[PDB]
């Protein structure tokens, strides 16, 4: 920060709930805990300009966990192809996806 009075005195008024992997009230993990932890543990000691390209894989995995865009694309593609095939009459959905399965437990 501008005036690191917290680091001066060792207190944490606000710098302990800065992100997701940070002390949820009872120990319930937020989603992308692992991804954010890994990104942050890569980007430590480094600052900025070097972390933005030496810790890019981990940030990209985090971004896909949180915003989760490529899985939307993947399922949308699978669904679109399925609808095309069912319209053409090529695909035949099974019982365990039409609503008739043997429940496991």
């Amino acid at each position: 920060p501008f005036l690191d009075i917290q680091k001066k005195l060792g207190i944490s008024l606000d710098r302990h709930f800065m992100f997701l992997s940070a002390e949820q009230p009872y120990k319930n993990a937020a989603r992308c805990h692992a991804f954010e932890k890994e990104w942050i543990e890569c980007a430590h000691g480094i600052g900025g300009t070097r972390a933005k390209k030496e810790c890019k894989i981990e940030f990209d995995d985090f971004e896909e966990c949180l915003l989760r865009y490529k899985t939307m694309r993947r399922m949308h593609d699978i669904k679109k192809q399925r609808e095309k095939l069912m319209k053409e009459g090529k695909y035949t959905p099974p019982p365990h996806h039409s609503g008739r399965e043997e429940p496991r437990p």
């Binding site: 890994e38 543990e41 890569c42 810790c55 894989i57 437990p105």
Partner: protein, 171 residues
């Protein structure tokens, strides 16, 4: 880029308990004492190794010990236990307090036969120190190597060479 590995259907085909929730809440306190070793091994694997795909067999042992447990309850103390869980399932939050007299029948049966004592108030709410032939997981989270920090300039610092190199100030 990398394909996900997954087990087959037959790597999950298992003899299931097929047993409801009040029948199970009734025998919870005895299933926490008996069949604790397998359950705690499964827990340690499931939390030490963050993958379900690395612990299916411990889950299968869990299911097996539970089935053996209820087989003991069936071949011995089936009627009092039936009455207990039947009266327990009536409630909406499945409260032990409303069925406190059938506990007595079930516990006296399961004590006079097999010597199974009910755990007291806070014995199932603590850590329990399991062992196993397994090893530690080396590098969970599949973490890559950490990049090396930038080196620190080692030196006993000196006066600035000719002071401030500003424009024309001498000192």
């Amino acid at each position: 880029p990398g394909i996900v590995e997954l087990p087959t259907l037959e790597e999950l085909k298992v003899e299931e308990v097929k047993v409801s929730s009040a029948v199970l809440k009734a025998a919870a306190h005895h299933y926490g004492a008996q069949c604790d070793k397998t359950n705690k091994e499964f827990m340690l694997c499931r939390w030490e190794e963050k993958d379900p795909r690395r612990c299916l067999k411990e889950g299968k042992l869990v299911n097996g010990c539970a089935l053996n447990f209820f087989r003991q309850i069936k071949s011995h103390c089936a009627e009092p236990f039936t009455e207990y869980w039947t009266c327990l399932d009536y409630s909406n939050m499945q409260l032990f307090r409303h069925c406190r007299q059938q506990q007595a029948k079930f516990d006296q049966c399961v004590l006079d036969k097999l010597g199974w004592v009910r755990p007291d108030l806070g014995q199932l709410s603590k850590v329990t120190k399991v062992k196993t032939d397994r090893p530690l997981p080396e590098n969970p989270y599949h973490s890559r190597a950490r990049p090396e920090p930038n080196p620190v300039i080692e030196g006993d610092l000196k006066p600035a060479k000719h002071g401030t190199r500003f424009f024309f100030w001498t000192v």
